Amino acid sequence: DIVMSQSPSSLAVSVGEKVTMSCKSSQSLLYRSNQKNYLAWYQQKPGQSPKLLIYWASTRESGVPDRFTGSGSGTDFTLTISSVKAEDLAVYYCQQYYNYPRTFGGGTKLEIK
Amino acid sequence: DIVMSQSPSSLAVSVGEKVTMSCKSSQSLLYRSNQKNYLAWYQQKPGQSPKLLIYWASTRESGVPDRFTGSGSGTDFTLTISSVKAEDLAVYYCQQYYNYPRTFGGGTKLEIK
Amino acid sequence: DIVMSQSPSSLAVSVGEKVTMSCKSSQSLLYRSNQKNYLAWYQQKPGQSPKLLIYWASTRESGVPDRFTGSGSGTDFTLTISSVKAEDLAVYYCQQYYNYPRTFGGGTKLEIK
Amino acid sequence: VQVQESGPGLVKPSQSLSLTCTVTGYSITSDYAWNWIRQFPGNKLEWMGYISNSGSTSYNPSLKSRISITRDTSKNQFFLQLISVTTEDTATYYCARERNYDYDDYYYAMDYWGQGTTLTV
Amino acid sequence: VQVQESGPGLVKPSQSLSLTCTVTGYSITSDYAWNWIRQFPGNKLEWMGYISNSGSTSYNPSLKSRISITRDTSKNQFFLQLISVTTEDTATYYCARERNYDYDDYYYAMDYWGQGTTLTV
Amino acid sequence: VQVQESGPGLVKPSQSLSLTCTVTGYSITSDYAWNWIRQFPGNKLEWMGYISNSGSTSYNPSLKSRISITRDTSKNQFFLQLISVTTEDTATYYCARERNYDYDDYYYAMDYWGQGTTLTV
Amino acid sequence: LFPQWHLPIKIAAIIASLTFLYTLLREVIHPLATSHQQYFYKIPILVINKVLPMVSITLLALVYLPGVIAAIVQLHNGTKKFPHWLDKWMLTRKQFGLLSFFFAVLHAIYSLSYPMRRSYRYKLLNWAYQQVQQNKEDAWIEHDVWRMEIYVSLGIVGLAILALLAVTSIPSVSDSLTWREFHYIQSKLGIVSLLLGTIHALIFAWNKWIDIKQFVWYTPPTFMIAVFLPIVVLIFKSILFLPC
Amino acid sequence: LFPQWHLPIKIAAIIASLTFLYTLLREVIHPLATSHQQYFYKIPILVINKVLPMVSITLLALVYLPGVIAAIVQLHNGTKKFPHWLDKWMLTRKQFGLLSFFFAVLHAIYSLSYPMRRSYRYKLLNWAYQQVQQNKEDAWIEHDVWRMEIYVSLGIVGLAILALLAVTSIPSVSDSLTWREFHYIQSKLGIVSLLLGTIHALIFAWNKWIDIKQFVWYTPPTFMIAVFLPIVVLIFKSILFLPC
Amino acid sequence: LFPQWHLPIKIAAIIASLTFLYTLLREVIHPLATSHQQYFYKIPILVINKVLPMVSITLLALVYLPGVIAAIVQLHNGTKKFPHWLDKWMLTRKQFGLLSFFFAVLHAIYSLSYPMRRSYRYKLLNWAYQQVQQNKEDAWIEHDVWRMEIYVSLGIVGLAILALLAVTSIPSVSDSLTWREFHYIQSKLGIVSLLLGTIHALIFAWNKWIDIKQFVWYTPPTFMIAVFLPIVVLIFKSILFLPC
Ligand code: HEM
Ligand code: HEM
Ligand code: HEM
Ligand SMILES: CCCCCCCCCCCCCC(=O)OC[C@H](COP(=O)([O-])O)OC(=O)CCCCCCCCCCCCC
Ligand SMILES: CCCCCCCCCCCCCC(=O)OC[C@H](COP(=O)([O-])O)OC(=O)CCCCCCCCCCCCC
Ligand SMILES: CCCCCCCCCCCCCC(=O)OC[C@H](COP(=O)([O-])O)OC(=O)CCCCCCCCCCCCC
């Protein structure tokens, strides 16, 4: 099982400020056949179901604000928010679908200050 | 594991009468490569070993009376006996060999009346 | 799991004398693609780590004395020592790497007399 | 597409439960595989298993023995059976869909999730 | 071809048994795979495992851990080892053959069965 | 190449240990797969699992559940986790390397071994 | 030095060079710029095998395009001369039919070498693993097998007919048949190879027309530009075949 | 219009049409009628590639069949004329040798395109899964590999020799060799290609002779009808080679 | 009977027979003697496909080897006659260029038939099983895919250029071009095919030069002997191209 590890367990930030969240993987999530990293980022609002934000570690899901930008390749991935807004207060998970079984990260709780 | 389910658990019939036994499958037993359904029908006389009657759901085993005719495709298979005789009193199982492990049905006990 | 079985559990011999050790396998260790038997012979000196002697059942490891000669194919393999010396007092294991998991033999303890 | 979970809310330990994932507005067999994810109270997600649109299933090896995912294509339903529940099995169970496997770019993502159901032992 | 099962009739629980499937009139390695099927007293069949004519075996995952199917090609015999028997293991054990795998039309059927042996714990 | 095992020497039963296989003088990711072998006091070797130079692992099915082999490529280390140790787990643990898989002539041999570490429960 | 081959080669080089940069842009440059992906291994074969067929089927369409233009301008004026640019074009029809065949056999050999490459082996092993990983028996897809069997079969019989056009271009074989026989091969059987060539490409695009993933930024897929000219030539040959 | 090609084409069309319906009946109609099975995807390639070789090897046998008949009727009468039907047949030997080669290269290309199809991919993934499903390492089968390496190698050298017969049929190349050289290629090397062609088909039927599954209802497999005529021609060429 | 083909065939038969025994010794005899291994299935294809390319590229090098020798001996004496052995050799350059092409297409067809064999199927199923057995996703190897895409692409365009040399050897087509055009194809484009042919073999040996496993007892691998002569011819053609 690929062990996902998110660096900041819980980090605070103020409205309108850049923030980054890391997702350190166990092994490489890059299929060398088609060089796409198989890692997604979810966002679980308080008391809601997790909704997809970024799949393949770089492409935003249809209907996601432009301030979410994911980057990285191999074993180190990062989710960046250009300007944190009030509605961006949620828990952000990173999962991998490189193989089975799928594994999620520990979750990064974002606390607005 | 493909779950096999036989509809009549135990049905009675008189000598010289048509009878049908169903075998509802979990998933399709049809290999689309060579369109053959992988399902067999066995007959266990009282106190004997189960002997094969019909394999691939339509072809009779060499040495089986003509009154046994199996039909169906996909997930619904039927074993039909045109004229029940006195020696046709046995338990009829349907198994699948579509993949591993092989699974048998619950068995349909035929009671002559 | 391929069950390896060494015939002599413990056999004695004097210095300067031919000796043979058998390794009866469960199934064939011969890949018919490239006809190489996948079986190795190790030698564990008293209180040391096992060192490789012969791999592929016939080829000596670089740095092994010439007196060690392995033969056999299929399910019966033999390790032969032309002239037993004083430093050849050790336990000899035969393992297979035909598939996973790897399995070792019971070990043949060589006692110099 | 509107999916909704169901099933019991309280079960006794060392028992067997059965959840439901009635899918509305779409066919469960066309072009979507459905997975079963559970979230422990410690906000820790775990992928239990999935079932392809052809009946093929694959479960998490950590609980592959005591699990079973069946479907009823006649009414667009799924069923998750935990044959021997324990104290650890209490969690929130979501059934989320994903675009099925493709030879060009495989394993897309689990896009749409359900509101999930709470399970207590 | 005449096949005949053997082995103990009564064993103690939490023990290890070993059955035999001495095949007469035919070679167990040419063109036939042999399976081990057991039938519970409730007239419920279960496929335990099979062994190909090349030594390759495959067991039922529900009891894959506590099972082992070996062969003795020198005398056309098979051996079914249940390392830890239980009350549930009492049943009638048949060893039935089947025409081995083929790339054109695979997995033919289990045609010929044995008279089976009764096992009690 | 000089390899050296590490880890505890005495652990309590029903606990979790973690060994180390710090490799010196060579990179653990280039062209070598590393296996974990343990030797019981009865001079009986057993192959626990291996880890390829790409992070791919494969464990012995007899203990596949309670085992885990990770690596730290930043310092050329390996880690063997036994999540639930028992009385049977006491043995001498070696980590031996092998030339990695090749499509022409696969599965070369476990050539170089380590001095191993003793583990007692 | 080769006076009758200057015009066909320059047209063949322009179409090849223009298609190459166009295909290289959609398959290599676009993935490299956005969401960095190497894909540089596709250049030697998977890109060349998209330039050869487009050059082959375009040059083949330019053989019968003057035959249609010459007919409509004969009716547009009712009677008798041809413009200089057209009559010069009518003479190079023999060379176009040969370059079209020379690139058809290259497109043929490149296509038959697909299962030989290593990239095809490593993708088979990945698919086989990913299928076992998800316990999916019977990876068969019926409608996809139907597609591959048809357009491959049509492409072979479409190439066989071109071989008849090429073998009748040998001056010893060409100067051995009466004009009625020679005109029967170059015209009747010749247009059939163009028909089988474009259907070989349409069946290849079973449902890629409606797909939007084909358009990288806004450019159409390379096969839509390839089959455009032959379709125009074929329908006008059919219109002229009606009573007129 | 093509006076010397009417008879060979009509014979080629009759053999092709008759074999097509015969092969389509054993591979598609019979499974569809009894125990309904589609198998419609086999028509474009797996059925056409059983008509081309039978047409190719039969037309090749009809090239040397008159050479044997002309010899036995010369001895049957001792001396000197040929019947009208035979002398008319002797003239069309050049055309038969060309159609036989034209269908041999089609049978060649269709065969080389087997691993390219999708039906071959989806069967490899199923076999790979079914092998992992039953824990069967080393799927190698020795005697089956021996079969495939031989009849494929013989079929290629059998086609190369036909290419020499075809290239010497060009009127410029044909009218460049003395009669002894031309007769040496068309007769000595020509009959060798027929020998390598029929062995290419016999080795393909390694053990399918004794198998009863080949006979659908009562008809023999398609290769038994194909190799029948060449075997007759070869043994009579050998009998005539004995002192007589 | 074929007076101008005696010398080229005898040289082609000597190179083929000598390479065959040499390749058969390294691939079959050596494994059979030491550490008994059958490997007899490699003879029909995997051994023949190592004789054809070496014969093809050696005969191709013998076409331009006299062109280099004739130039250095013209400068070695300053002025004007050729020895008998050289002028006799200069005449058979047309035949060498044809046999080289006849074995190139055989080497082409044998190579395209690799994924069709059964030995390739049974090895794919073993690799697929051994990959699942060790839980190794993504069997892709980048630098190995780079190798296969290049030398296969170069071998095809290297064969296409040879086809131009062969088609211009037809006496009707040959006696249709001025000497400047004919000499431009046989010399300028001809040496390019030799260049693409030897690079097609060097790229095939990506790193097999430094490997010692290639040398069975002490003999070099078969490709090192193949590319030896063309490399000598190419560098001397380059030296002569310098001002001299
Ligand atoms: C030996 C016979 C032939 C074979 C095996 C063959 C094979 C193929 C294959 C496999 C493709 C799909 C390429 C891909 O995967 O991207 C293709 C595409 C194509 N072929 Fe052929 N072909 C043959 C003959 C022809 C002929 C005679 C023509 C017409 C002159 C032709 C024109 C095309 C065109 C226009 C395409 C589409 C190019 C594109 O993708 O944009 N082919 N062929
Ligand atoms: C390029 C060289 C050739 C190749 C690669 C080749 C390949 C094949 C293959 C793969 C088959 C088996 C078809 C199947 O799987 O059903 C076959 C069958 C056959 N080939 Fe060839 N072949 C070649 C040349 C020839 C030649 C020169 C002849 C003789 C004219 C010939 C006559 C046949 C015949 C008669 C059959 C049996 C047809 C049947 O199944 O009924 N082939 N060939
Ligand atoms: C249709 C185009 C061609 C293809 C597909 C092709 C394919 C191949 C392949 C696959 C190999 C490696 C053989 C192996 O695996 O052992 C090879 C080797 C070789 N090819 Fe080609 N080739 C082509 C054209 C040519 C041409 C035009 C030449 C030059 C006359 C040539 C000369 C060679 C040589 C010298 C070797 C190395 C032989 C050896 O292994 O010792 N090939 N070719
Ligand atoms: C992909 C398919 C390729 C097929 C190649 C062969 C096809 C031949 C089909 C027939 C072509 C000629 C048609 C025709 O009417 O020719 C008549 C003429 C003989 O005339 P006459 O002497 O009877 O009056 O005929 C001749 O004398 C012309 C004979 C030409 C033969 C050319 C053979 C070239 C082979 C090259 C190598 C191919 C390797 C694959
Ligand atoms: C692997 C690639 C194979 C490609 C095969 C075809 C390549 C053709 C390339 C051009 C060759 C001729 C070059 C040239 O200058 O020829 C001029 C001449 C016509 O001269 P003119 O009448 O215009 O004065 O031209 C002619 O009249 C000669 C025409 C010769 C056509 C030969 C076709 C043979 C086909 C055999 C079957 C192939 C099956 C694959
Ligand atoms: C599958 C294998 C295909 C192989 C194709 C090439 C085989 C050539 C073998 C030799 C054929 C000619 C034999 C012969 O004696 O010809 C003599 C003649 C030259 O005579 P002279 O001028 O020396 O007096 O010779 C000539 O002038 C005739 C030259 C004919 C060349 C034809 C080439 C056609 C190529 C078509 C495209 C093929 C693509 C694969």
Author numbering:
A (entry chain N), B (entry chain M), C (entry chain L): 1 to 113
D (entry chain J), E (entry chain I), F (entry chain H): 2 to 122
G (entry chain B), H (entry chain A), I (entry chain C): 67 to 145, 148 to 312
Per the authors:
Since its discovery in 1999 as a multispan membrane protein highly expressed on prostate cancer cells, six-transmembrane epithelial antigen of the prostate 1 (STEAP1) emerged as a cancer antigen expressed in various human cancers, including prostate, bladder, colorectal, lung, ovarian, and breast carcinoma and Ewing sarcoma. STEAP1 belongs to a protein family that comprises three metalloreductases, STEAP2–STEAP4, also known as STAMP1–STAMP3 (20–22), which reduce iron(III) and copper(II) and are also associated with cancer progression. At the molecular level, the four STEAP proteins are predicted to adopt a common architecture with intracellular N and C termini, six transmembrane helices, and a single heme B prosthetic group bound in the transmembrane domain (TMD). In contrast to STEAP2–STEAP4, STEAP1 does not exhibit metalloreductase activity when overexpressed on mammalian cells, suggesting that it may have a distinct yet unidentified function.
